[PDB]
Amino acid sequence: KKRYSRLQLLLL
Amino acid sequence: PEHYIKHPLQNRWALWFFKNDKSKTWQANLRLISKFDTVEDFWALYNHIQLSSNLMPGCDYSLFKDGIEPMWEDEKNKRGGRWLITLNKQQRRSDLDRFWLETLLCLIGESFDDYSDDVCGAVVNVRAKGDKIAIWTTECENREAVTHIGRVYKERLGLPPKIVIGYQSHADTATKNRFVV
């Protein structure tokens, strides 16, 4: 299952 | 893989657009844009379409899970309902966009943890009398799931306890708040 935080999503 | 693979999303999501025309029927002003299942493909999408603040009055953006359509008549929405954010006219400038992008990040990031599956999608309404953002969920009787989603969402949008937000079912709206957070 894939989860990404707010910080991960902006960085990427 | 680390070096060349796209970062995958749990779900495929479809962005929709609703146009204001009023001569034409609802089922024709609602029209798909593009689907995506990665972070990088989401930014390619987000970076080239317009911000919510720049849309002509009466138009909507919608992000829904692949296979679920942004209308409550859909199987996964019909017993559902929605956390509603009401924005005053001044908040177009200050809050609308940054709230919309945060909503999109909550969805694609799968931020509601063990009730991620209850989430269907989200809808931004650009309106002259008050803009609106809603996260739509699948079953309005799941008290535990519906509650947690609300609290996650308020927290992430950064609202203080002062502010209270409403959840209402699509039945009640067709035909008050079932829950407040």
Side-chain angles (χ1 to χ4, degrees), chain A residues 1-6 8-10 12, chain B residues 7-8 10 43 102 105 109-111 156:
Chain A
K1 295 193 181 294
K2 307 300 296 195
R3 180 175 190 186
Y4 306 88
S5 56
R6 186 184 188 286
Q8 283 175 275
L9 290 178
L10 295 179
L12 246 21
Chain B
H7 300 79
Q10 168 92 259
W43 292 111
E102 189 65 54
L105 305 186
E110 301 272 344
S111 315
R156 277 284 223 115

Side-chain angles (χ1 to χ4, degrees), chain B residues 12-25 28-110:
Chain B
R12 192 176 279 144
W13 296 90
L15 189 64
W16 304 76
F17 183 79
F18 182 84
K19 174 68 183 143
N20 206 5
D21 205 310
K22 251 179 269 91
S23 37
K24 303 178 152 196
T25 63
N29 283 138
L30 175 54
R31 185 246 177 167
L32 173 81
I33 298 162
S34 157
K35 319 194 179 190
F36 66 81
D37 57 4
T38 72
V39 184
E40 294 89 350
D41 293 315
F42 162 76
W43 292 111
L45 179 50
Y46 182 81
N47 281 327
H48 86 275
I49 73 206
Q50 229 114 50
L51 294 168
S52 294
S53 41
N54 243 57
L55 297 189
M56 295 185 44
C59 293
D60 310 322
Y61 274 138
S62 276
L63 198 83
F64 270 75
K65 272 183 194 164
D66 184 27
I68 309 178
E69 313 190 302
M71 55 185 57
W72 72 275
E73 289 100 343
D74 195 285
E75 296 303 343
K76 291 281 189 170
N77 301 316
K78 59 183 185 192
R79 303 156 231 113
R82 77 188 164 165
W83 286 104
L84 184 60
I85 310 288
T86 269
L87 295 184
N88 69 43
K89 296 183 167 217
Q90 290 78 55
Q91 291 175 273
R92 178 164 287 151
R93 159 173 182 273
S94 51
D95 300 342
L96 180 65
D97 296 344
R98 83 196 160 72
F99 285 4
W100 184 230
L101 174 55
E102 189 65 54
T103 302
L104 293 175
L105 305 186
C106 283
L107 289 186
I108 73 171
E110 301 272 344

